[PDB]
Amino acid sequence: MRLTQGCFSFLPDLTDQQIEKQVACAMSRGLAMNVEWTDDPHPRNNYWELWGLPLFDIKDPATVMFELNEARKSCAAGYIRMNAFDASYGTESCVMSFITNRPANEPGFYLDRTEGVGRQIVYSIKSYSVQANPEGSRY
């Protein structure tokens, strides 16, 4: 299956040229970019691993693309996402996050069902990749 976290996952995988244009747009708005990696695709896995610090003082989109491609060389198989952070009062939050890399094969998830009170079901979304192997050797 295709993990459709991120804001462009219903489009084809973005080329580096497409990614650089999104980075340029964000940086022209004064946003701070960072790159993060995970091999736990669970929808509640809030904290993907940081690739260094956010690039607060960087002005050149080429420097962001450089770090993205260093992350791609170094990280294990899994997911990489690119984020843009707005520290402005009233936001102080991420304003764009999209997938830059995904595994060739993502088995996805199943729905675990526990019998609750009455007719209620207690649900757990379980990742096939995570239950099978530890971090760093899931894909």
């Binding site: 993990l3 459709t4 219903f10 244009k21 929808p43 936001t91 939050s93 996050s97």
Partner: protein, 482 residues
């Protein structure tokens, strides 16, 4: 002779009898507005022969401390402090005998954190006064000090996106259709299909509460199965606005607690429930980690016409103060009324940290929002994915675009309808960020056709609804240009 006669008040202001409101202290052209005052802007159409200043002073008086005849009990109070003052009356441009009237209210007139008390004064009686043939409340300046007594949005735009892990594009939704008649089992099926096909949310229709064809617990449990199925099928947080609107506060709380107990990310309420239930559930939503979607049912009974009622931009302020997380706020291009200058003004009021005077957009007051959280506007009703370039242009980034008929009416099924809408949205945002002149009719539609070349569901949707438009003359229109 008698003590009552000897002690009768004899002054000009407090001897018994009737005098004009503008001579009772409710008109003051020299009034210096305080930063703690509540300010109101009314569009006043006096009856023929009623002086425009006297009409404004009558509104100020009968919405603060006055009645129709002088009362000595005023003298038992600090009466000058509590009188509201009409302080400015301007003719409305391009109009005959209609005026904009600015009125200032002392901070202490109002119960802290109470929309019911604020509205009891501001709209309570003055709209029925014989001497004014039409009255519309157009804008209000709620001061920072009063705003701090209110919660503001339970969640707010920022925390909402963090709970959903969704940043970069508008959010996507759809009302289940037909409006009425479906079973709880079939409701869950539609929710499952729409979410699995790409939507972030579906929602109960505003009139779906609990009925012979479907009692509410059947809907809630089946929707949670559909929601969790779609989440496991996609790896995304999913939800559906479970409608907890009910006859009594006890029943509303029952439905809200049930939604929490089964793990729903969101519930919805209808505006017809009224301000006191809305504030109660807004506090509840914060305390119970629940997103709170407000459907504005009934709003257009008073917000539609330019001459009389309450402009919706004021409802926006009151509902952001009360603390709903979403509110429906218009589409411009869909089936419901929406002049784009008015709509853009509504969206600014819901989303910005502060407001600057912007008369073409109906923003008559500068206003700080006192760090109350931002309220998410919802664009819904008769829109389709062929309009995506218009939606992005008019409505911006932080909005839920909802496609009910525009999803479920897709010939190849509900999943295909959802996929068409999501592909159109993402392709349009991608092209916007690349610099495209996407609002241009020579550009926006092409962006969509380009994406359709590799998305069959989108091509089919464009073919089906391409020529659908709702181009009608607006009733709620601006008075200033730019």
């Amino acid at each position: 002779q008698s003590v009552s006669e000897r002690t009768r008040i004899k002054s000009d202001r407090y001897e018994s009898g009737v005098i004009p409101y503008a001579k009772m202290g409710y008109w003051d052209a020299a009034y210096s507005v305080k930063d703690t005052d509540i300010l109101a802007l009314f569009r006043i159409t006096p009856q023929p022969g009623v002086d425009p200043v006297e009409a404004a002073a009558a509104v100020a008086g009968e919405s603060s401390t006055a009645t129709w005849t002088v009362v000595w009990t005023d003298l038992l109070t600090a009466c000058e402090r509590y009188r509201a003052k009409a302080y400015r009356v301007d003719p409305v441009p391009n109009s005959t005998d209609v005026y904009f009237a600015f009125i200032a209210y002392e901070c202490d007139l109002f119960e802290e954190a109470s929309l019911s008390n604020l509205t009891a004064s501001i709209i309570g009686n003055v709209f029925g006064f014989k001497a004014i043939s039409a009255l519309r409340l157009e804008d209000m300046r709620i001061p920072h000090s009063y705003l701090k007594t209110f919660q503001g949005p339970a969640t707010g735009i920022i925390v909402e996106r963090e709970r959903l892990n969704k940043y970069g594009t508008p959010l996507l939704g759809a009302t289940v259709k037909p409006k009425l008649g479906l079973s709880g089992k079939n409701y869950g099926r539609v929710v499952y299909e729409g979410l699995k096909g790409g939507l972030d949310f579906l929602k109960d229709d505003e009139n779906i509460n609990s009925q012979p064809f479907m009692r509410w617990r059947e809907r809630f449990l089946n929707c949670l199965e559909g929601i969790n199925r779609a989440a496991a099928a996609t790896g995304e947080v999913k939800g559906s606005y479970l409608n907890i609107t009910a006859a009594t506060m006890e029943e509303v709380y029952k439905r809200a607690e049930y939604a929490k107990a089964i793990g729903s990310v969101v519930v919805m309420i209808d505006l017809v429930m009224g301000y006191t239930a809305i504030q109660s559930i807004a506090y509840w939503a914060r305390e119970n980690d629940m997103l709170l979607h407000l459907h504005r049912a009934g709003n257009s009974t008073y917000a539609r016409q330019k001459n009389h009622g309450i402009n919706f931009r004021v409802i926006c302020k009151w509902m952001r103060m009360s603390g709903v997380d979403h509110i429906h706020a218009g589409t411009v291009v869909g089936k419901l009324e929406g002049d784009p200058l008015m709509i853009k003004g509504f969206y600014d009021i819901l989303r910005l940290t502060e407001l600057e005077v912007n008369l073409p957009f109906g923003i008559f007051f500068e206003m700080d929002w006192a760090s109350l959280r931002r309220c998410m506007p919802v664009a819904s009703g008769g829109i389709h994915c062929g309009q995506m370039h218009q939606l992005i242009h008019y409505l911006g980034d932080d909005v839920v675009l909802q496609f009910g008929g525009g999803t479920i009416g897709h010939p190849d099924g509900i999943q295909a309808g959802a996929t068409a809408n999501r592909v159109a949205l993402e392709a349009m945002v991608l092209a916007r960020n690349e610099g495209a002149d996407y609002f241009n009719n020579q550009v926006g539609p092409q962006i969509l056709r380009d994406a359709a070349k590799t998305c069959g569901p989108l091509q089919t949707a464009l073919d089906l609804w391409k020529d659908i438009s709702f181009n009608y003359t607006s009733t709620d229109t601006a008075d200033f240009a730019e």
